[PDB]
C-alpha cells in the first residue's frame, strides 16, 4: 500500500483480521519463550498494531498527495469490546 | 458478562423488586380503602336494584356501550380481558356507538373500533369515584349523547369475583320508555304528573355508572396488587439466579487473573 501511496495514488487496504495476527503473534512469542502480559498476550501488541495502522495515511501535496486508507476487522467475542485485543 | 454487568445488572433489578414490594403494599393500602366505596356503592344500588327485581322492567326488542378502566394500566389481564368482552358485545351489534371511560380501554377499542366511540372520559383512576363526577357524567350523556333515545344500553365494569380473581361484567340499563311498559309497573304506586319514569332513569343511571366505576375500580387495584405480587415473586427468583451467575463470575475472574500472574511468574529464569 506503500508503494501506491508513494507513488501519489490512493489505496485502501482490507486487513481481516487483526485478531487472527494477534493470535499468531501470541504463538510466536510464546514459543520464543517470551513472557506474556495480559491475556498470555504479548506485551507489544499494541505497539505491533500501532506500528501497523500508523503505516496508513493521507501524504502532503509535496509528497504527491498520495493515501493509504485502512480497514481493520475484529470479530469479537459474545458481543464484547472489554476485552484487551 | 463481566462482573460489571452482572454487578449493575442484579443491583438494578434488586431496586426493581424493592419498587416492586413498595408498590404492593401501597396497591393493599389503596384497595382497603377502595373497598369502602365499593360497598358504600353497592348497597346504596342494591336499595334500587331491588325494585327492579320487583318492578321487572325487563324490555323488548342501535345500542350504548359504557366501557370502565382507569387512565393507568400496571393491571394485568383487565384493559385487554374488558375490550375482549367490548369485542364479543360489539360484534354481535357492530353499529353500537362507544362512550369509554378511561384512557387505556380507549387505546383498547379505538385500534380496534375508531368508529364507535364518539365521547371519552379522562381524569378518572386516581381517586375512588364520587357520586358528584358520576352524577355529572350521567348529566353529560343526557347532554351529548342523548342516551333516553337510545333503545339499548349496556355498561361494562369489572366485577372482582375475588382478591385474586375478576370478571368484566355487563350490566343492561333500561330506559324510562321501558319503565312505564313494565309489567310489574302498576303494583308500585306511582304519580302520573311528577315525571318519577323520567327522573329515576336518570337516578338509574348515575347510581349504575357510580357503581361500575367504584367496583372497576376496586378491581383493577385488586388484579394490579396481584400483578406486583408476581412481579416482586418473579424478580426475587431472577435475583435469586443472578446472584449465582454473579459468584461464579466472581470467581472465574479471580482464577483467570491469577493464572495469567502464575503464568508470568512460570517462565522466569
Not at chain 2, 384493559?79 to 362512550?99: C, F, G, T
Request: proline content about 4%; hydrophobic content about 40%.
Amino acid at each position: 500500500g506503500e508503494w501506491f501511496r508513494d507513488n501519489g495514488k490512493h489505496a485502501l487496504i482490507v486487513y481481516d483480521d487483526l485478531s487472527k495476527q494477534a493470535v499468531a503473534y501470541r504463538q510466536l512469542s510464546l514459543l520464543l519463550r517470551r513472557p506474556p502480559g495480559r491475556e498470555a498476550y504479548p506485551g507489544d501488541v499494541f505497539y505491533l498494531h500501532s506500528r501497523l495502522l500508523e503505516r496508513a495515511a493521507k501524504l502532503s501535496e509535496k509528497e504527491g498527495s498520495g493515501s493509504l486508507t485502512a480497514l481493520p476487522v475484529i470479530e469479537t467475542q459474545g458481543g464484547d469490546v472489554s476485552a484487551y485485543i | 458478562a463481566t462482573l460489571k454487568e452482572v454487578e449493575m445488572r442484579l443491583k438494578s433489578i434488586k431496586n426493581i423488586e424493592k419498587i416492586t414490594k413498595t408498590m404492593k403494599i401501597v396497591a393493599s393500602t389503596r384497595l382497603s380503602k377502595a373497598e369502602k366505596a365499593k360497598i358504600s356503592a353497592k348497597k346504596m344500588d342494591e336499595a334500587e336494584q331491588l325494585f327492579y327485581k320487583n318492578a321487572e322492567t325487563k324490555n323488548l326488542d342501535k345500542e350504548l356501550i359504557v366501557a370502565i378502566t382507569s387512565d393507568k394500566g400496571l393491571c394485568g389481564s383487565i384493559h385487554s380481558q374488558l375490550a375482549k368482552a367490548v369485542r364479543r358485545h360489539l360484534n354481535d351489534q357492530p353499529n353500537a356507538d362507544i362512550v369509554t371511560i378511561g384512557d387505556k380501554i380507549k387505546m383498547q377499542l379505538l385500534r380496534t373500533h375508531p368508529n364507535n366511540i364518539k365521547l371519552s372520559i379522562n381524569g378518572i383512576g386516581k381517586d375512588a369515584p364520587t357520586f358528584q363526577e358520576s352524577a355529572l357524567i350521567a348529566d353529560k350523556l343526557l347532554s351529548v349523547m342523548k342516551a333516553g333515545t337510545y333503545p339499548k344500553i349496556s355498561i361494562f365494569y369489572n366485577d372482582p369475583v375475588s382478591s385474586l380473581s375478576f370478571e368484566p361484567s355487563e350490566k343492561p340499563i333500561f330506559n324510562a320508555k321501558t319503565i312505564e311498559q313494565s309489567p310489574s309497573f302498576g303494583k308500585f304506586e306511582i304519580d302520573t304528573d311528577a315525571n318519577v319514569p323520567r327522573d329515576l332513569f336518570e337516578y338509574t343511571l348515575a347510581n349504575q355508572m357510580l357503581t361500575a366505576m367504584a367496583q372497576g375500580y376496586a378491581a383493577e387495584i385488586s388484579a394490579r396488587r396481584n400483578a406486583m405480587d408476581n412481579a416482586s415473586k418473579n424478580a426475587g427468583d431472577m435475583i435469586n439466579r443472578y446472584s449465582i451467575l454473579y459468584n461464579r463470575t466472581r470467581q472465574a475472574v479471580i482464577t483467570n487473573e491469577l493464572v495469567d500472574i502464575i503464568t508470568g511468574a512460570s517462565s522466569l529464569g
